[PDB]
Amino acid sequence: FEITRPPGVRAHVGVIGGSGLYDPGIVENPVEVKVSTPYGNPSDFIVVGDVAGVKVAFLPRHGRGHRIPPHAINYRANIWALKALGVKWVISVSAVGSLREDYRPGDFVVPDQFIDMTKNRRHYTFYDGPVTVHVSMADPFCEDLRQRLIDSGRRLGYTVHERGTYVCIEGPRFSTRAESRVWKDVFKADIIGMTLVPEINLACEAQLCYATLAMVTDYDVWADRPVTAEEVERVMISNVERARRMLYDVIPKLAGEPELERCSCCRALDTAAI
Amino acid sequence: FEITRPPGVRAHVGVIGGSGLYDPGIVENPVEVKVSTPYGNPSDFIVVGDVAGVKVAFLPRHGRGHRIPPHAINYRANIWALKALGVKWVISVSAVGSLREDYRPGDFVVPDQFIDMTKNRRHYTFYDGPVTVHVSMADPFCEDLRQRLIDSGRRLGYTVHERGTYVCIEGPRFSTRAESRVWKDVFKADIIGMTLVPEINLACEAQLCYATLAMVTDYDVWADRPVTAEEVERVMISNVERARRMLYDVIPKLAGEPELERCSCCRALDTAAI
Amino acid sequence: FEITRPPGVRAHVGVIGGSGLYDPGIVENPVEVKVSTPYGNPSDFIVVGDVAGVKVAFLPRHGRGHRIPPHAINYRANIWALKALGVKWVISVSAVGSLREDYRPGDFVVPDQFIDMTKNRRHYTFYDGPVTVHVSMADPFCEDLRQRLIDSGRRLGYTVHERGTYVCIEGPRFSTRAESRVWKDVFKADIIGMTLVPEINLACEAQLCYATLAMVTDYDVWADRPVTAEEVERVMISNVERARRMLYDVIPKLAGEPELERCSCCRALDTAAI
Numbered sequence: 001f002e003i004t005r006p007p008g009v010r011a012h013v014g015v016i017g018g019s020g021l022y023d024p025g026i027v028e029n030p031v032e033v034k035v036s037t038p039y040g041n042p043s044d045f046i047v048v049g050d051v052a053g054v055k056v057a058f059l060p061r062h063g064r065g066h067r068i069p070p071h072a073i074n075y076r077a078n079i080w081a082l083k084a085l086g087v088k089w090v091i092s093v094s095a096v097g098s099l100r101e102d103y104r105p106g107d108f109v110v111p112d113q114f115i116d117m118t119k120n121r122r123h124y125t126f127y128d129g130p131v132t133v134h135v136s137m138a139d140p141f142c143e144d145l146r147q148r149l150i151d152s153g154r155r156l157g158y159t160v161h162e163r164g165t166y167v168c169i170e171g172p173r174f175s176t177r178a179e180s181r182v183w184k185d186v187f188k189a190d191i192i193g194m195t196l197v198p199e200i201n202l203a204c205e206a207q208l209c210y211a212t213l214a215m216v217t218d219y220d221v222w223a224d225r226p227v228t229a230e231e232v233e234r235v236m237i238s239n240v241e242r243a244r245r246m247l248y249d250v251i252p253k254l255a256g257e258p259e260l261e262r263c264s265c266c267r268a269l270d271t272a273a274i
Numbered sequence: 275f276e277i278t279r280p281p282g283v284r285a286h287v288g289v290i291g292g293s294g295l296y297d298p299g300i301v302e303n304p305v306e307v308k309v310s311t312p313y314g315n316p317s318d319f320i321v322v323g324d325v326a327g328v329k330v331a332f333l334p335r336h337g338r339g340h341r342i343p344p345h346a347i348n349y350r351a352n353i354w355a356l357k358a359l360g361v362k363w364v365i366s367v368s369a370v371g372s373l374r375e376d377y378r379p380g381d382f383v384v385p386d387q388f389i390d391m392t393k394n395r396r397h398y399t400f401y402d403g404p405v406t407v408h409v410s411m412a413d414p415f416c417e418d419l420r421q422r423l424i425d426s427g428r429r430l431g432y433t434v435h436e437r438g439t440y441v442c443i444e445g446p447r448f449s450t451r452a453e454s455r456v457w458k459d460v461f462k463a464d465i466i467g468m469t470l471v472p473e474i475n476l477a478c479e480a481q482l483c484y485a486t487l488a489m490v491t492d493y494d495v496w497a498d499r500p501v502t503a504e505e506v507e508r509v510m511i512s513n514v515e516r517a518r519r520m521l522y523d524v525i526p527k528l529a530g531e532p533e534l535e536r537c538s539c540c541r542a543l544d545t546a547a548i
Numbered sequence: 549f550e551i552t553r554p555p556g557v558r559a560h561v562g563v564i565g566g567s568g569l570y571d572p573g574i575v576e577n578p579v580e581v582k583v584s585t586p587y588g589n590p591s592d593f594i595v596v597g598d599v600a601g602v603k604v605a606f607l608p609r610h611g612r613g614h615r616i617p618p619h620a621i622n623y624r625a626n627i628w629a630l631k632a633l634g635v636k637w638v639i640s641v642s643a644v645g646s647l648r649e650d651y652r653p654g655d656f657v658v659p660d661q662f663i664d665m666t667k668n669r670r671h672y673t674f675y676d677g678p679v680t681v682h683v684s685m686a687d688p689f690c691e692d693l694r695q696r697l698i699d700s701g702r703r704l705g706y707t708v709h710e711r712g713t714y715v716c717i718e719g720p721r722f723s724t725r726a727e728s729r730v731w732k733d734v735f736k737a738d739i740i741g742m743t744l745v746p747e748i749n750l751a752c753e754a755q756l757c758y759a760t761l762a763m764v765t766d767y768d769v770w771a772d773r774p775v776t777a778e779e780v781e782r783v784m785i786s787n788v789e790r791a792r793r794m795l796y797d798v799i800p801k802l803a804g805e806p807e808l809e810r811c812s813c814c815r816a817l818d819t820a821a822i
């Protein structure tokens with residue numbers, strides 16, 4: 001079934017850019033690639049090129065120009081396409097709100113947990129039968145990659161919070177005050193966004209080593225002015241150079257393979273399929 | 275694209291009637307209007323007429339005869355149609371359950387917050403791309419209208435609770451005891467219903483001044499007999515005259531425009547669109 | 549509309565088998581039956597036969613061979629088909645995780661409450677209009693049947709926990725640690741599974757006496773190794789003989805009708821329809 005145009009393209013690391021991150025810059029020797037999927041179009045062309053001898057595939061989850069809101073993303077096509085290229089590692093870069101004073105706008109967070117409060121994403125899996133698949137996601141992120149992101153941040157002198165629970169909401173509207181109080185005071189979540197689920201579910205089912213590098217862009221409803229879309233975008237674009245510096249530091253060190261014992265999803269299917 | 279039959283019809287105030295409220299009574303000079311929408315049919319004909327020189331559009335959200343349950347309402351068509359008529363203010367009248375002893379059957383509530391626990395409403399926005407829109411809904415109701423409803427209630431001698439958090443559930447079944455304990459004791463919500471979301475989301479995106487006048491019809495699972503549909507309908511029909519008296523008091527005072535500084539959604543799109 | 553092949557088949561008790569329970573064994577005089585529904589195919593053929601003079605209909609909710617995951621089950625077709633055969637009682641057998649130390653793998657639980665945390669089941673009711681139906685589900689299980697299951701377990705010498713709140717999650721992935729902490733410590737649920745909703749909703753709307761016999765197969769994320777699909781299936785298959793012994797004990801005593809005063813859904817429609 002699988003066809004790419006141009007043919008024969010492969011990559012080792014995938015980067016899924018979120019808010020503010022619509023192009024890479026600069027993969028060398030870039031090529032725009034069309035990757036067939038059983039689910040139709042990924043968000044945009046995938047750009048494949050080289051970073052210090054490592055082949056990287058970049059996909060803007062919202063499309064170039066931020067054309068696709070969180071609820072309308074073809075998550076299945078995006079992850080299928082990256083898997084079809086041969087990627088082993090996936091770095092997601094995302095904008096998040098903070099539910100705690102000490103996670104400040106401009107700080108990075110490398111989450112370790114999530115809570116799914118989405119509702120309208122239509123498909124939360126690749127496996128609709130006849131092989132029933134129930135992956136374990138107790139520890140949903142790839143720890144090998146998490147630790148490499150934290151190390152890079154520290155080496156560059158950036159603040160990187162080493163843990164966090166991400167509450168994923170449906171959107172596109174932001175939370176009410178009453179909702180935000182539930183997330184913060186009842187669920188004791190740390191950060192909030194709209195795009196993690198079902199991206200992470202699908203990455204795990206695909207046996208990828210996936211981790212999120214989140215940038216705090218706002219304090220949700222808790223600052224004297226509530227979050228707006230314009231604020232999020234401005235803070236992300238202001239800080240995108242720091243995100244790029246982290247990526248160009250991390251990627252050369254991903255030439256090898258994830259360590260199985262620090263990659264919860266890397267053999268996910270072995271015990272998950274009935 | 276926009277066509278009405280008859281042509282040329284406009285209105286200033288919209289009223290969305292809930293349980294028990296299927297006709298107005300009596301807009302003068304009433305006309306039934308068909309309003310084209312990109313989403314198909316609204317719940318029913320919209321009835322447009324005059325109340326003390328203010329043009330009012332009435333829409334029964336469940337259709338005449340209560341034909342459309344909460345999960346099957348074409349929320350996008352309903353709000354598009356009201357916007358297309360030129361309305362600035364939208365009064366929703368709704369039946370709710372109470373999660374607290376002091377919010378008693380027969381009392382009105384003018385909520386200020388909500389928590390969305392729906393799942394199956396299919397579209398929670400008008401904006402699916404390519405313009406991505408994330409409206410702020412920290413304070414989701416229009417405060418100008420809330421205060422006018424409270425003032426009218428007080429002037430008429432009715433009990434009107436001046437705040438409340440509405441938990442919106444999916445339905446159509448009512449809550450289990452275990453669910454109701456979560457709403458009451460964990461989320462600390464005050465009232466419960468099925469129709470607020472995504473109606474309110476869409477109204478905000480449409481830059482309307484929307485507020486809910488809720489009538490408590492029951493105590494959910496917490497009275498010696500649990501809520502039934504027959505009970506809700508009976509209590510609403512018993513009290514509909516009081517709701518009508520409030521409307522005929524409020525509407526003449528809506529001849530002007532919402533105050534921007536007391537209308538959180540009136541310029542929602544200015545900072546929400548990417 | 550209603551056609552069966554072969555024609556004329558009727559049954560009194562339905563059994564909906566979950567994980568590990570794909571065939572009965574041994575209804576005498578078994579026949580595989582096709583039952584037309586307005587919703588298309590049930591999960592598999594329904595097998596009808598006799599158990600000590602009581603006519604029983606068995607339906608594997610996942611299909612033979614566990615071909616259909618929880619989110620892909622045609623719940624409406626399954627319950628319509630059982631109702632069309634004339635069943636009055638429905639015993640569901642299900643695998644669940646435990647959120648409490650004392651509900652141990654191998655123990656049975658007869659839940660009394662549930663919390664619905666699903667999102668993607670598409671239809672949560674039979675009633676989409678023009679008759680609006682809102683069933684009361686404060687006490688969602690049929691108490692007559694619950695008590696008969698508990699009595700059978702005790703008579704056979706098995707551990708059967710006499711109450712429990714079932715949290716139904718969407719899946720197919722298992723919960724994260726952060727999610728499981730919400731279920732356990734915030735919602736104070738006892739057991740967790742994926743298939744109860746909307747099966748139970750539909751059974752109640754169909755005026756069936758429905759109860760769940762759950763078998764604890766795992767402790768979710770809380771044991772030194774998190775739950776896997778292979779573990780659940782193995783524990784269920786190891787214990788399926790005990791589930792069969794309970795069924796063959798209970799079924800002969802269901803020759804009569806549910807007691808109305810101990811069957812919350814048996815006249816559900818009387819007060820639910822508008």
Ligand SMILES: CSC[C@H]1O[C@@H](n2cnc3c(N)ncnc32)[C@H](O)[C@@H]1O
Nearest residue numbers: 019095096097193194195220229232
């Ligand atoms: C560009 S504005 C929209 C983006 O903001 C992200 N995000 C940032 N702050 C928040 C917040 N407070 N709540 C929800 N999502 C947020 C979401 O993942 C979404 O794609």
Ligand SMILES: CSC[C@H]1O[C@@H](n2cnc3c(N)ncnc32)[C@H](O)[C@@H]1O
Nearest residue numbers: 293369370371467468469494503506
């Ligand atoms: C006419 S019965 C159905 C209506 O009852 C309203 N409602 C009243 N009481 C409750 C309650 N306790 N829980 C949920 N919705 C309720 C819902 O919004 C729905 O449209």
Ligand SMILES: CSC[C@H]1O[C@@H](n2cnc3c(N)ncnc32)[C@H](O)[C@@H]1O
Nearest residue numbers: 567643644645741742743768777780
């Ligand atoms: C055969 S593995 C999948 C089945 O496990 C059941 N189940 C058992 N343990 C759990 C658990 N911890 N969480 C969710 N569902 C579970 C679900 O209802 C599902 O159909």
